[PDB]
Ligand binder design. Structure first.
Ligand SMILES: *[C@@H]1O[C@H](CO[C@@H]2O[C@@H](C)[C@@H](O)[C@@H](O)[C@@H]2O)[C@@H](O[C@@H]2O[C@H](CO)[C@@H](O[C@@H]3O[C@H](CO)[C@@H](O)[C@H](O)[C@@H]3O)[C@H](O)[C@H]2NC(C)=O)[C@H](O)[C@H]1NC(C)=O
Ligand SMILES: *[C@@H]1O[C@H](CO[C@H]2O[C@@H](C)[C@@H](O)[C@@H](O)[C@@H]2O)[C@@H](O[C@@H]2O[C@H](CO)[C@@H](O[C@@H]3O[C@H](CO)[C@@H](O)[C@H](O)[C@@H]3O)[C@H](O)[C@H]2NC(C)=O)[C@H](O)[C@H]1NC(C)=O
Length: 129
């Protein structure tokens, strides 16, 4: 245990930019480090972004994109843009050497992404939103 570092929460900008880096630990360097980002909800949890961190290539988020992520050394950086009040929640950083056998690593418990709601008025006493 204690071989995976990830922020428990993440502060997002007003636009909705939530970016954090979940590092992982491996016995060596390989071409395939499958990463996964999940969103947890009280009713159920669903998959979101996923790609193979190839040390000589970039992650592909063609399926369920709506997100951008980077990977360097042993730290994977995930950035989210467009987080509404409902979008705010938990994001799980996953790290799995799934392609090479015989696959053995760990997943991140998850970082909560926080966002700020801008208001056209100096206070919410009237016309709150
Ligand atoms: C996570 O790491 C990024 C740095 O990653 C940069 O962008 C990634 C998508 C990868 O391609 C990396 O190879 C690249 O170095 C930290 O900052 C990020 O910097 C980039 C570069 O300035 C920002 O995106 C750029 O946007 C311009 C505008 O069109 C483009 O021209 C560039 O091609 C590039 O896409 C990116 O917005 C920025 N991330 C943020 C703040 O959203 C980032 O800070 C770090 N995360 C944290 C907070 O640790
Ligand atoms: C955040 O981390 C916790 C850590 O929980 C235990 O995880 C194991 C691997 C070990 O490190 C131990 O020291 C930790 O306390 C994750 O919670 C654990 O999750 C696993 C599955 O992901 C659970 O295993 C289950 O085991 C039962 C057998 O009793 C099987 O029937 C199930 O199929 C399953 O394999 C384990 O019970 C959980 N333990 C705890 C303490 O909760 C947690 O999943 C992770 N967050 C993420 C990535 O979602």
């Amino acid at each position: 245990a204690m071989h995976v570092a990830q922020p428990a929460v993440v502060l997002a900008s007003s636009r909705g930019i939530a970016s954090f880096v979940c590092e992982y630990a491996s016995p060596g360097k390989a071409t395939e480090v499958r990463v996964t980002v999940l969103r947890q909800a009280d009713s159920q949890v669903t998959e979101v972004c996923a790609a193979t961190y190839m040390m000589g290539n970039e992650l592909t988020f063609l399926d369920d994109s709506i997100c951008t992520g980077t990977s360097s050394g042993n730290q994977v950086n995930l950035t989210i843009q467009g987080l509404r009040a409902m979008d705010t929640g938990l994001y799980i950083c996953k790290v799995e050497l799934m392609y090479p056998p015989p696959y053995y690593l760990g997943i991140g418990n998850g970082t909560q992404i926080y966002v700020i709601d801008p208001e056209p008025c100096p206070d919410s006493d009237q016309e709150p939103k």
